[PDB]
């Protein structure tokens, strides 16, 4: 019984079998996956969706599927994922987002994130939500700072689930706490 969340334009909902085709197309898109190690095949796409469903089943929240009523059934995901890996800022909850390029430049990731963080702070009453990306992924960390999240460059970290010499290992960390979120 996953709780659906509404924004002006977006419905943040549980994933459905019919989303897997659309999400597979996104995951096969080199523009969507530019700042990730590689594009995913259908098998790898479906495996990510399985982890999302598992997260929802365990925690009652997760990276929500993004529906746009009056327009499109599925445009990607935005939502929360518990951080359990061996990093300095664990344990905590992260926020992440992936949109079909057709829906870029419309403030839809912004709106989805505002809906997710409202849930995070008003409903779950989390003390903090984090987000991390690579320096070249400016669309991603641009959104983080526009949402009012803030980065300390001293908190730059090597991702523990990548090789020690991996060229995409260096990540930057953004944080927003309940006070900062309530204040903006
Ligand atoms: C990261 C990502 C979600 C950002 O999406 P986005 O559409 O650029 O983000 P926003 O929702 O903040 O939209 C901002 C843009 O829309 C505009 N905008 C913002 N609010 C708006 C509104 N209410 N109405 C109209 N336009 C609006 C802004 O001017 C901006 O345009 P610009 O980027 O050309 O300057 C998207 O690029 C993506 O999915 N990237 C690939 C996957 C990825 O790397 N994810 C992150 C992994 S760490």
Author numbering: 9 to 192
Study authors write:
Enzymes in the Gcn5-related N-acetyltransferase (GNAT) superfamily are widespread and critically involved in multiple cellular processes ranging from antibiotic resistance to histone modification. This study shows that the Pseudomonas aeruginosa PA3944 enzyme uses a nucleophilic serine residue and a hybrid ping-pong mechanism for catalysis instead of a general acid/base mechanism.
Since our kinetic studies showed the enzyme utilized a ping-pong or hybrid ping-pong mechanism, we attempted to obtain a crystal structure of the protein with S148 acetylated. All of our previous structures of the enzyme were determined in the presence of CoA. In addition to adding AcCoA for co-crystallization, we also included (R)-3-(2-chloroacetamido)-4-(((S)-1-methoxy-1-oxo-3-phenylpropan-2-yl)amino)-4-oxobutanoic acid. While this compound was present in the crystallization solution, it was not observed in the crystal structure; the rationale and synthesis of this compound as an alternate substrate will be described in a separate manuscript. Based on the observed electron density, we modeled CoA in chain A and AcCoA in chain B. In this structure, we did not observe any additional density around S148 that would indicate its acetylation in the crystal. However, we did observe a very small amount of AcCoA cleavage in the presence of the enzyme and absence of acceptor substrates in our kinetic assays, possibly indicating the enzyme could form an acyl-enzyme intermediate required for a kinetic mechanism with a ping-pong component. Further studies are necessary to show the acyl-enzyme intermediate is indeed formed but are beyond the scope of this current study. This structure was nonetheless useful for docking experiments.
